[PDB]
């Protein structure tokens, strides 16, 4: 049973619809089908496809029976020919509608036989070309009788009858065959932790290094590292595991369950777009703790105090971020900053702003003459940050850091703005 789309929000809504369509007891002032068809007219709007045939026809018909019910001056042109015309159309549809779908086939039961199977009286199927083929349209009474009869049938078989007859495994398998290769690669990482440190050079500068000596070296130059390649392959399995932006939030859920301070340095350097996914997840995890007392996040399990978090994780990322890498992706960050607002972000931005200045004092390189074009970017970034920093410092004081420790652990609107803090909802209620 994979879910189906249906235009009504709820079953209760459907319950609401049925009662409108057939007023109980009396129809004198509560006919409530002028409104009933007004709604179904919307469901058609959300999609034609989604609406059931029976629902669609129960509105189409009740439309036409309502059309004839006009009895007042000023006298209308109507010749009672459109209305004679309308009643039939619903029926050719409404009756054609049951047989054809699901689906009319090269091998199919003859029409009379099919009508019997559903529960359709075979006096309908006579109907199907009954209007179209015959020279002249039937009289009003014959149609009137049929609608007030058919409608009861719709109520009789679908509205008032419950007969029910008419993903989990294969899509969980690919996810399974991901997590294992993940947990196989992390369990390959720990055994290498020592090796990565000895070889600081291999991970750190992979983007950095333009040229390789072996290619440069001449053939047969003179008579004359499987822990380097073993690192790069483990890293390759990290990039390859990272191409899939779908399970990103589960690579992390496993990473933070096995946090290594050293690892973060490795990941940020050699995994494109890894720097802004972590902090984004650190915020979603952080806020979530704030919103609900109950769900002690992986972050609160890893970290039981704000300070512990700041030195161990929050501070560490800032130190290792490439100034250029952060710049060259600022748009991602502003959204990151824009999307989610919380004190943590303020400390981040301020810390991010601070280091931007200390890379200016350090600025008096030989390469300074070159700098002028790129100066017009760093300032802008500094410029945006001040707007974002000053913003938050009006919403978030240091009074919130106390609302992270105090939780007991478990042992305007502007046009087209990103919505700052979001909890996923299925197209309902934000």
């Amino acid at each position: 049973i994979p879910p189906r789309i249906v235009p009504w929000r709820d079953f209760a809504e459907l319950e609401e619809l049925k009662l409108w369509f057939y007023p109980k007891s009396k129809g004198t002032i509560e006919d409530k089908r002028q409104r009933a068809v007004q709604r179904v007219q919307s469901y058609r709007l959300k999609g034609s496809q989604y609406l059931p045939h029976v629902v669609d026809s129960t509105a189409q018909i009740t439309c036409a029976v309502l059309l004839d019910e006009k009895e007042a001056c000023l006298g209308v042109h109507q010749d009672s020919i459109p209305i004679r015309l309308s009643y039939v159309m619903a029926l050719i549809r409404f009756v054609n509608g049951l047989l054809d779908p699901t689906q009319q086939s090269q091998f199919a039961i003859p029409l009379h036989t099919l009508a019997a199977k559903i529960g359709l009286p075979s006096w309908f199927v006579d109907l199907r070309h009954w209007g179209t083929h015959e020279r002249d349209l039937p009289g009003l009474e014959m149609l009137r009788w049929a609608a007030n009869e058919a409608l009861s049938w719709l109520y009789d078989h679908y509205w008032n009858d419950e007969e029910l007859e008419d993903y989990g495994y294969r899509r969980n398998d690919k996810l399974e065959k991901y997590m294992e290769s993940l947990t196989k690669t992390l369990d390959k990482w720990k055994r290498l932790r020592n090796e990565f440190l000895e070889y600081k050079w291999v991970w750190e500068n992979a983007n950095d290094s333009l040229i390789t000596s072996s290619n440069f070296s001449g053939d047969n130059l003179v008579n004359y590292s499987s822990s380097e390649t073993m690192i790069r392959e483990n890293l390759r399995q990290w990039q390859e595991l990272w191409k899939l932006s779908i399970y990103h939030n589960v690579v992390l859920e496993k990473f933070f369950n096995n946090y290594d301070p050293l690892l973060l340095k490795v990941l940020m350097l050699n995994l494109n777009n890894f720097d802004w996914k972590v902090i984004e997840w650190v915020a979603r995890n952080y806020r979530t703790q704030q919103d609900d007392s109950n769900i002690t996040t992986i972050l609160k399990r890893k970290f039981n105090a704000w300070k512990e978090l700041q030195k161990r994780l929050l501070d560490v990322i800032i130190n290792n971020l490439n100034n250029k890498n952060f710049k060259n992706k600022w748009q991602n960050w502003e959204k990151l900053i824009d999307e989610n607002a919380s004190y943590l972000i303020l400390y981040f931005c301020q810390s991010m702003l601070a280091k931007l200045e200390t890379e200016k004092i350090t600025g008096n390189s030989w390469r300074n003459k070159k700098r002028r074009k790129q100066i017009d970017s760093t300032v802008e970034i500094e410029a945006k940050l001040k707007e974002n920093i000053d913003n938050l410092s009006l919403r978030f004081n240091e009074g919130e850091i106390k609302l992270y420790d105090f939780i007991p652990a478990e042992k305007p609107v502007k046009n087209w703005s990103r919505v700052q803090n979001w909890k996923p909802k299925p197209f309902g209620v934000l």
């Binding site: 049973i1 879910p3 189906r4 789309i5 009504w8 929000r9 079953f11 409104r35 007004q38 709604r39 007219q41 709007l45 959300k46 034609s48 496809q49 989604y50 609406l51 059931p52 045939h53 509608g97 054809d100 779908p101 699901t102 689906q103 559903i118 078989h157 679908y158 009858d161 419950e162 029910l164 007859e165 008419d166 993903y167 989990g168 899509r171 969980n172 690919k174 390859e240 191409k243 899939l244 932006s245 779908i246 399970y247 990103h248 939030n249 494109n272 609107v413 046009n415 087209w416 703005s417 990103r418 919505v419 979001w422 996923p424 909802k425 299925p426 197209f427 309902g428 209620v429 934000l430």
Partner: protein, 529 residues
């Protein structure tokens, strides 16, 4: 008959193959070549080996043509396209999983490789280039340099005729010339007015769009190529023009006029919706006299072509322009691909992928396929003023919608953001806090991007919604003053985004889902089809 040169090539799965060999090369997916030495024979076309990378789009649905070698003279080859995302869709979309790679290949599949190698054993069929087509398509080539006038070329086909590939073959052929002619500044503008299986335009939309000479992108990209820039566009809102004939002809008529105003001189290309049997001869018969085509074309052959004959001839005129003073007539074999057309890929199944590729498309070559419901939508407010949104446009039917239930319809419905060029006055009829454009009309409006509504807040009057990420900041770019219109038309929001696969997204078990029911359907509620 033996594989060669599957070099590991570090990151990016870069690979090598040899020009010299007499067996045609095959491949499936998104790759990009620079030849070292030796010429190439793709679709009977020549590109030299001198160090210019050419991307190659090989979606599965279209027939895939081999890569041919020729002189002179040989014997980074084949390397991955720079897309993080595009290949990964399947996890989001079950149907399109095998689009770039066949399900069982008899080659060793590699997760890190964009491009797969196919050799006979695999099912996929290479039509390559029909010989019959070439004499017409070939002879069109002789009329680009020669004419000395802008050449307007129209092609009309029933869907499955093969017009989309005849155009790219023209398109590929023409582009090669533009790179090599000095000074040829006459970049062709594709004029894609078919929303049925649109190529080069936004879902259920219409576009006149320029085609860039370099760097090369071929052949079929499912509209995901970086090679075209949208000059102007319009949104029909329907699978076919027929649902809204009145606008489309008008919608198109405004398209060509743009060509005049920018005063283009040079090549232009168009495929109409084929409309072979139906209202089409009259509908086509309107913009044939407008487009002033130099070379109208036909492909049906034993189409059968019977329906698509008489109307055009009446439609056909002596000239569409003072300098032109001409018309041309031709008919062609209409069959490609030779194998059954769906190839496991009905157009109706592919179209909903294009809607998907946009919303999940982060950048020109980077796609993130996480279900939208994780991404946070941007918010603008429909309002009493309103300042962000003043009125939403509904097609002519649906006029009588009662106010209370207006909100429910909007949420979860794909919509097309429009910008109003300066307007004499706002034309708002409002029910229950939504301002609705009561009389329709409103010809002034402009098309920036589609959006899909996440939810709407009656009280704040704010309207949370998603927009494809690439489009920001273009929405950001438009002045704050400029009016915003939400147009509701019958485009299909994909199911896959609407309720994410349970594994894909974790929701609190308690939370109600507004628009879905998991009860088995009582007999017999079915969508008539």
């Amino acid at each position: 008959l033996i594989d060669n040169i599957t070099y590991e090539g570090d990151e990016d799965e870069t690979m090598f193959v040899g020009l010299k060999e007499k067996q045609k090369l095959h491949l499936s997916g998104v790759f990009r070549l620079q030849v070292v030495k030796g010429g190439i024979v793709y679709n009977n076309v020549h590109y030299n080996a001198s160090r210019e990378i050419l991307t190659f789009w090989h979606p599965l649905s279209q027939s895939i043509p081999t890569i041919d070698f020729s002189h002179f003279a040989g014997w980074l080859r084949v390397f991955n396209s720079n897309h993080t995302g595009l290949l990964e869709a399947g996890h989001l979309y079950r149907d399109v999983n095998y689009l770039w790679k066949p399900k069982e290949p008899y080659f060793p599949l590699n997760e890190r490789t964009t491009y797969h190698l196919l050799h006979e054993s695999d099912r996929i069929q290479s039509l390559s280039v029909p010989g019959y087509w070439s004499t017409p398509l070939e002879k069109l080539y002789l009329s680009h340099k020669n004419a000395a006038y802008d050449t307007r070329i129209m092609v009309i086909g029933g869907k499955n005729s093969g017009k989309s590939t005849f155009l790219r073959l023209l398109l590929e052929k023409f582009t090669q010339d533009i790179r090599d002619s000095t000074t040829s500044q006459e970049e062709l503008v594709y004029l894609d007015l078919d929303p049925g299986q649109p190529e080069y335009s936004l879902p259920d939309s219409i576009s006149l769009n320029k085609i860039l000479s370099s760097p090369i992108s071929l052949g079929q990209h499912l509209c995901q190529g970086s090679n075209f820039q949208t000059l102007l566009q319009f949104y029909a809102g329907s699978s076919s023009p027929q649902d809204e004939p009145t606008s489309y002809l008008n919608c198109a008529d405004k398209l060509i006029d743009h060509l005049e105003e920018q005063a283009f001189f040079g090549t232009s290309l168009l495929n109409l919706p084929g409309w072979i049997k139906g209202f089409g001869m009259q509908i086509l018969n309107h913009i044939i006299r407008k487009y002033k085509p130099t070379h109208l074309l036909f492909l049906e052959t034993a189409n059968s072509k019977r329906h698509l004959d008489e109307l055009t001839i009446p439609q056909s005129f002596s000239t569409s322009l003072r300098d032109a003073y001409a018309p041309e007539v031709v008919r062609v074999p209409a069959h490609s691909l030779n194998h059954t057309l769906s190839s496991r890929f009905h157009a109706s199944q592919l179209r909903t992928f294009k809607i998907l590729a946009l919303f999940h498309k982060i950048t020109q070559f980077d796609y993130d396929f996480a279900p939208l419901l994780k991404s946070a939508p941007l918010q603008i407010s429909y309002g009493k003023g309103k300042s962000g949104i003043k009125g939403i446009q509904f097609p002519m039917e649906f006029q009588d919608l009662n106010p209370q239930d207006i909100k429910s319809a909007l949420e979860g419905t794909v919509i097309g953001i429009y910008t109003y060029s300066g307007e004499d006055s706002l034309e708002v009829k409002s029910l229950n806090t939504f301002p609705i454009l009561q009389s329709c009309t409103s010809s002034s409006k402009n098309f920036i991007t589609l959006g899909l509504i996440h939810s709407i807040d009656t009280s704040q009057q704010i309207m949370n919604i998603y927009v494809p990420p690439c489009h920001t900041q273009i929405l950001d770019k438009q002045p704050e003053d400029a009016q915003w219109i939400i147009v509701r038309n019958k485009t299909e929001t994909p199911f896959c985004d609407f309720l994410p696969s349970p594994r894909t997204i974790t929701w609190d078990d308690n939370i109600q889902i507004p628009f879905a029911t998991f009860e088995r359907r009582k007999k017999l509620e079915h969508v008539w089809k």
